[PDB]
Structures are given as C-alpha cells and as structure tokens.
Amino acid sequence: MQIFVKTLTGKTITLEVEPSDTIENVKAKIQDKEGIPPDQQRLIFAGKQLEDGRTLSDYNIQKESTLHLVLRL
C-alpha cells in the first residue's frame, strides 16, 4: 500500500509499505528517498509521536494515510 509523508516545507514523499512494517522500516525508506538519517527523523500521526519498534497497524495507519516528518538536531 501507499502512504504519504509531509514535511514542514510542504514536500510530499510517497512510500510503499505493508501494514506490518515497523516505524524503523519507514524511517529507512525515507532515508532512501530523501537522504535524512533515521536518527534525525521524528514521525507524527494523529497527534502522536510514533515509536521505532511498533508497526503501522499498531497506529491504525491505512492505505493513503499521511504522516508528518519532523527533524531533530
């Protein structure tokens, strides 16, 4: 399935994921598209920060959902 990732600048990233994928898998897919190291990524959905070891299904993230990507420093 496709999900979307939006950044503060308005960039949109499309990823191919399965609902069983972990958040750490999603961060590595973002690195492949954008070059941002996973340890500098923070992902937000539905007002909540997503944890690396949980899965997309844990957060009820479905086909065509949009995640928000923030950066650390």
Added chain:
Amino acid sequence: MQIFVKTLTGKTITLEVEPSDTIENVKAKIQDKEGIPPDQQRLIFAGKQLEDGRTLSDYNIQKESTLHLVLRL
C-alpha cells in the same frame, strides 16, 4: 437541527442535520450542499478529528455547534 460548518476562509455554512446523524451522513449532506466529495472532507470538533461511523451526539455536537471543515486531497 442546525449546525455550522466553518471553512478555513472563515465562511460559515449552515447545515440541517439530525442529532443522531453519523459523521458519514454529515459528509454526504456537505456534498449535497457544497459539492465537495466526502473523501476530500476532514471535519474537526473541539480538538478531535471526527470518525465516519460515530454519531454527532456521540461527540457532544448539538444545535449551533461549529465543525471545522478542512479539505484534504
């Protein structure tokens, strides 16, 4: 029962609904009045993103409450 639906331009639409209507029913009524497809509508009330299968009463939405309509697309 009348509720108000406020867009991001400040335009307030008056909508006739029943107090037991589901959110999906409300999105259908916005489609009928404004011409916006339900899949492009996101409704927010007092902090919460409204889910399609629940009723207005289940969110404590009542006469002359305001819902905020965000277009998502």
Added chain:
Amino acid sequence: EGAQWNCTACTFLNHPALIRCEQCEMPRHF
C-alpha cells in the same frame, strides 16, 4: 513547552513537535 496545542484555525489538538497544524498547515506561531 512539552504540551499539546490547539490550532487556532481548525482547533485540532497537535503534538508539540509540529509548528504547523497536522490537519490544515496553519502555523502555531502566527
């Protein structure tokens, strides 16, 4: 500083790590 914040445009209750609303992209610090 760690609290959630409501968007002044659509009311959505946002995570503190966002400085624009997750629903409507309205900036927090207008």
